Design a protein around this ligand. Structure first.
Ligand SMILES: Cc1cn(-c2cc(N)cc(C(F)(F)F)c2)cn1
Length: 330
């Protein structure tokens, strides 16, 4: 089997991407944030504290004839941006783009933090990291991809995120019309539960490529590109007037600037992020200071190839017995 679903930016800055997901019988369609950096499929629900729901579409398990409460199971997660959610667990039928899994753990939120409440466009998350990170207790649950994998034509999914435009998540096949050139595959470590890999280096604009190993994670659930402070300083030094602002929490730059591209290495291959992908707009409405899309990972403890990097590529998440990651230009 295969599935294919369109993923759409939630706003004009590509702050996140939502993909429609059918849950239950009859289907309840929710728009979920597909997140290769986490491993829980959780949703706003009829159980979510009412004051914490502000415009999201909710899953109502009592209206799904295939929903079953998973006895005694709870979940609780916190993300690197400080956000969090928790609740109970159902199993139900979940379909993405025509691909159906029965008995998928659907984690129903009883509580969500304010940043989730304040984002009316995201109805929950669909985790696509390794199932070892799933938070359900006392019996850990499998991701949607892990449950689908054996049925897929090939044990893979691909991310093709758009810049200011829709894109696609495919499951079970590689669309050879969706990229240019070849796909370069690179080794993955699953030891931390992530799609963790090592980039071979970087260049800023038309500058010389610096060969240097950069270990990091392919994370569709993180908006920005988080890299070592030395790399990020080298990037922003090429933007007149850019500076790291402690009050804002990262590098900002004059909105009148034209940003240079940023290239990262995948083996001998090179993925070029156009400068415009790095502009995240005014720091507050009407400001002429703009937020940068490449930021230091120093406070985080891991480098993160988030949407800013991934949307410049066609990305293969190969879930074969030894997982690998593939990147192509597009
Ligand atoms: C904006 C942002 C994202 N993250 C973050 C994301 C992931 N997937 C994992 C981690 C951790 F540190 F746990 F490895 C951090 C932190 N800040």
């Amino acid at each position: 089997s295969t599935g294919s679903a369109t993923t759409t930016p939630i706003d004009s800055l590509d702050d996140a991407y939502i993909t429609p997901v059918q849950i239950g019988t009859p289907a309840q369609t929710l728009n979920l944030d597909f997140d290769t950096g986490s491993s829980d499929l959780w949703v706003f629900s009829s159980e979510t504290t009412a004051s914490e729901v502000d415009g999201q579409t909710i899953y109502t398990p009592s209206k799904s004839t295939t929903a079953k409460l998973l006895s005694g199971a709870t979940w609780s997660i916190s993300y690197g941006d400080g956000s969090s959610s928790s609740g109970d667990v159902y199993t139900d039928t979940v379909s993405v783009g025509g691909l159906t899994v029965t008995g998928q753990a659907v984690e129903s939120a009883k509580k969500v933090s304010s940043s989730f409440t304040e984002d009316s466009t995201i109805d929950g998350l669909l985790g696509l990291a390794f199932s070892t990170l799933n938070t359900v207790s006392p019996t850990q649950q499998k991701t949607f991809f892990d449950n689908a994998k054996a049925s897929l034509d090939s044990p893979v999914f691909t991310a093709d995120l758009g810049y200011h435009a829709p894109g696609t998540y495919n499951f079970g096949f590689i669309d050879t019309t969706a990229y240019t050139g070849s796909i370069t595959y690179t080794a993955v470590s699953t030891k931390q539960g992530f799609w963790e890999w090592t980039s071979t280096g970087y260049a800023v604009g038309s500058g010389t490529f610096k060969s240097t190993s950069i270990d990091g994670i392919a994370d569709t659930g993180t908006t920005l590109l988080y890299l070592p402070a030395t790399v990020v300083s080298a990037y922003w030094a090429q933007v007149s007037g850019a500076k790291s602002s402690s009050s804002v929490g990262g590098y900002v730059f004059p909105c009148s600037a034209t940003l240079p591209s940023f290239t990262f290495g995948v083996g001998s291959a090179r993925i070029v992020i156009p400068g415009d992908y790095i502009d995240f707009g005014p720091i507050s409405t009407g400001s002429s200071s703009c937020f940068g899309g490449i930021q230091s990972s120093a406070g985080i403890g891991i480098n993160i190839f988030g949407d800013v990097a991934l949307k410049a590529a066609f990305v293969v998440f190969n879930g074969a017995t030894t997982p690998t990651l593939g990147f192509a230009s597009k």
